[PDB]
């Protein structure tokens, strides 16, 4: 066992969202993508195999999948089609995911709170909170 496996592994379904449209605007997502992305009710699937963590987002809008080792930069094409350089670390039990592109930066934190997995997406001063529960 590991902390990561116990906390995060499994299949999660989105149950609430706040300020996601505003977050997407701050990121630079265009109107049509924001509208379609904002409707989605994704499942988030998290798995671990040795040192490799995989996070999948499955929805009618887009399916995404990242696999990574903590602390080790990788390439990511986001749901809104940004080509970013990402680094994910585990800081005090919180997965902290930094994306860099075009001189910009956004941070996504994933954490367990009670029976929820809370995803906080932050761009400058704009935060979106997306809450998931086990499927
Ligand atoms: O709830 C969430 C939100 N995600 C990030 C995410 C998804 C879609 C778009 Cl368009 C953008 Cl800008 C960011 S996630 O995959 O990290 N989980």
Among 21, 37, 77, 97, name the best residue to mutate to test ligand 1's pocket (greatest count of ligand atoms within 8 A of Cβ): 37
Question: Helices 20-27 & 31-39, crossing angle to 10 degrees?
Answer: 150
CB atoms within 10 A of CB 117: 24
Q: Is 108 in the pocket of ligand 1 (CB under 6 A)?
A: yes
Q: Give the C-alpha separation, 114 to 35, whole Å.
A: 30
Dihedral angle, C-alpha 64, 107, 104, 38, nearest 10 °: 50
CB atoms within 10 A of CB 128: 20
User: What residues form DSSP beta bridges with 1?
Assistant: none
Q: Give the C-alpha separation, 121 to 115, whole Å.
A: 19
Which atom of ligand 1 approaches the CA of 14 most closely? 1
Domains along the chain with CATH numbers: 3-132 (2.40.128.20)
């Amino acid at each position: 066992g590991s902390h990561m496996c116990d906390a995060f592994v499994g299949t999660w379904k989105l149950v609430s969202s706040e300020n996601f449209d505003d977050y997407m605007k701050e990121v630079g997502v265009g109107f049509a993508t924001r509208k379609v992305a904002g409707m989605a009710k994704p499942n988030m699937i998290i798995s671990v195999n040795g040192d490799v963590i995989t996070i999948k987002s499955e929805s009618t809008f887009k399916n995404t999948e990242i696999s990574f080792i903590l602390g080790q930069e990788f390439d990511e094409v986001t749901a809104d089609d940004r080509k970013v350089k990402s680094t994910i670390t585990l800081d005090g039990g919180v997965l902290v995911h930094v994306q860099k592109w075009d001189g910009k930066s956004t941070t996504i934190k994933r954490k367990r709170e009670d029976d929820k997995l809370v995803v906080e997406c932050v761009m400058k001063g704009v935060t979106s909170t997306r809450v998931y529960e086990r499927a």
